[PDB]
Amino acid sequence: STGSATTTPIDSLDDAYITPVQIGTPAQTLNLDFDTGSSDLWVFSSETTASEVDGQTIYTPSKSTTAKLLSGATWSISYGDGSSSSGDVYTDTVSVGGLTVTGQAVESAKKVSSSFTEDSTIDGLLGLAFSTLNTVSPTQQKTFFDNAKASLDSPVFTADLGYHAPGTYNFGFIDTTAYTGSITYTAVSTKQGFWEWTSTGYAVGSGTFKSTSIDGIADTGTTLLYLPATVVSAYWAQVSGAKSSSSVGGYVFPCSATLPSFTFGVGSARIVIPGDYIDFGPISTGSSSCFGGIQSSAGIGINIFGDVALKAAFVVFNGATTPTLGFASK
C-alpha cells in the first residue's frame, strides 16, 4: 500500500504545517501537525477541558463505531518549546492520504497548554519519530508509520515541505518526479529515539564550505534551524546590524537586509537554504526588526534541522531494519 497527503502552512511565515487525517467511522477529519521529533498521535477531543478549546476541530470517539477505549492507558507529553498535553487513549481507524491503519492509538487530550489552545489551526499532532519515545502508559503504543510499515510497498515516508506553499507527505514510495539530481543517504542513530544524523558541514552565502561534523535531528515539528553558537554567529556576522537579543530570545536583523543563503552538507552533497527562507518577519506588528530563522541550539542540548532546513530539500525517512535519511535538492 501507499498514501499521499498534502501539507499546508498554517500562516504566512510557515510556522508549522497541517495535514488532514481521517479518524474513526464515519470519518472525522482533523488537521494534524506531522512531527518527526515525537511519537504520540494526540488530538483535541470531546474530552478536552472546554476552556482550553478555541476553534479547533475535535475528535468525538462516541460518534465513531470503530473507537474503543484503551482501558487504563494514559499519556502525557512535554515539548521542547515548553508546551504540553495529556489525556487518555482510544484505538480507532486512522487514514492518511488513502493509507489506512486499523487499531491505531489515538491519544485524546483532556488537558492542553496555552500555546495549543491559542493556535486554532492545529487539531493535534501525529508523531513520526521512533516508537520508543511514545508516552502511553502502562503499555507503550506504536506510531502510525510503525503500524503501517509492514503493509507499505517500501518501509519509508517522505517529507516535501513548501516555502510559503503547500507540500506533500508520502508513505510507502519515493516520488522520483519530486526532486532534482540524486538522493544522498546518510546514517541514522536511533539511540535517543529521533531521526538523528551527522551533517558534514556548512557554508554562509557564497563563502567557502567548512567541513565539520554537526550531529542533529531531522524534525518537521520544529519551525527553525538550531545549530551550534559558532555556526550561527558566523551566519549572522554576514548581515549588517544583526544581533542576538536576549529580550526577544534570539538573533534579530534589520528588516531592510537581504539575507545570505545557508548551505548544509549531507555526505559529499550540499543543500542550499535560500536567504528568504531565513526571514521570519517583524518581531511585532510594524517593527523594523525581524526575527531570524537560524538560531543557536546552545540552550537546547541538541541541534535541530527543523522546517527552515527541511523545506529546502526532498527528505526520505527510511524505516528499513537499519534506518537511514536521504536528502535531495528540488
| Cα 314 from Cα 158, distance rounded (Å) | 7
Please list the residues that pair with 100 across neighbouring strands.
95
| Cα 324 from Cα 316, distance rounded (Å) | 8
Q: Which of these three, 116, 143, 174, is where a domain ends?
A: 174
Q: Going by C-beta distance under 8 Å and a sequence separation of 6 or more, which residues neighbour residue 266?
A: 184, 186, 199, 200, 327
8 Å CB contact between 168 and 7: yes
Helix (H, G, I), strand (E, B) or coil at 310: helix
Tell whether 182 and 262 lie within a shared domain: yes
Q: Look up the CATH number of the domain holding residue 181.
A: 2.40.70.10
Tell whether 112 and 194 lie within a shared domain: no
Resolution number, Å: 1.3
Please list the residues that pair with 52 across neighbouring strands.
none
Count Cβ atoms below 10 Å from residue 141 Cβ, excluding itself: 24
| Cα 188 from Cα 176, distance rounded (Å) | 22
In the chain the first and final C-alpha atoms are separated, in Å, by: 25
Tell whether 249 and 168 lie within a shared domain: no
Please list the residues that pair with 210 across neighbouring strands.
202
Tell whether 195 and 317 lie within a shared domain: yes
Tell whether 165 and 187 lie within a shared domain: no
Q: Which of these three, 174, 190, 221, is where a domain ends?
A: 174
Tell whether 170 and 52 lie within a shared domain: yes
| Cα 13 from Cα 193, distance rounded (Å) | 29
8 Å CB contact between 16 and 36: no
8 Å CB contact between 95 and 104: no
Q: Which of these three, 141, 174, 207, is where a domain ends?
A: 174
Q: How many CA atoms lie within 13 A of 31 on its CB side?
A: 15
Tell whether 168 and 203 lie within a shared domain: no
| Cα 171 from Cα 2, distance rounded (Å) | 5
8 Å CB contact between 156 and 319: yes
Tally of domains in the chain? 2
- The C-alpha cell at 95 is 487514514
Catalytic residues: 35, 199
Domain containing 201 equals 175-330
Tell whether 159 and 191 lie within a shared domain: no
